[PDB]
Model the fold of this input.
Amino acid sequence: TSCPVNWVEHQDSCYWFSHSGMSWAEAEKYCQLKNAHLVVINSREEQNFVQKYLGSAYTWMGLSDPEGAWKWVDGTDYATGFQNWKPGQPDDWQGHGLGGGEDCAHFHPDGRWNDDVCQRPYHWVCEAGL
Ligand SMILES: CC(=O)N[C@@H]1[C@@H](O)[C@@H](O)[C@@H](CO)O[C@@H]1O
Ligand SMILES: [Ca+2]
Ligand SMILES: [Ca+2]
Ligand SMILES: [Ca+2]
Ligand SMILES: [Ca+2]
Ligand SMILES: [Cl-]
Ligand SMILES: [Cl-]
Ligand SMILES: [Cl-]
Ligand SMILES: [Cl-]
Ligand SMILES: [Cl-]
Done:
């Protein structure tokens, strides 16, 4: 085993899928505590692997835009990288009325992405090197 117990190995990364929900900031903290990061989707092949094993619930990834531009937590370039947005997303929606727009990306159960309110308790995926 190249990955720790409770982690899944795929193509030179280890992944951990939560069975619980946290805000994006608390999930980011959790992953960093484990010497990992919220998942960064680098390719269609990795998107297919992650979406196949989602827990049938909205799930945070390591993609956010609170200071204006979309950034991956590990510095992977967003604009030249893989994208898989739901139709009409991202929309920085304000109409939830919770304050501000929407600055954190998550998967829908089908794998397509949405921007949502960072404070929402969603599932998350951690990713580390082998
Ligand atoms: C979970 C989900 O996709 N939520 C979105 C939300 O982020 C916003 O984009 C809204 C605009 O009408 O459409 C949906 O409710
Ligand atoms: Ca992180
Ligand atoms: Ca990755
Ligand atoms: Ca935004
Ligand atoms: Ca949205
Ligand atoms: Cl958990
Ligand atoms: Cl897209
Ligand atoms: Cl709006
Ligand atoms: Cl937000
Ligand atoms: Cl909520």
Notes: The chain has one domain: 1-130.
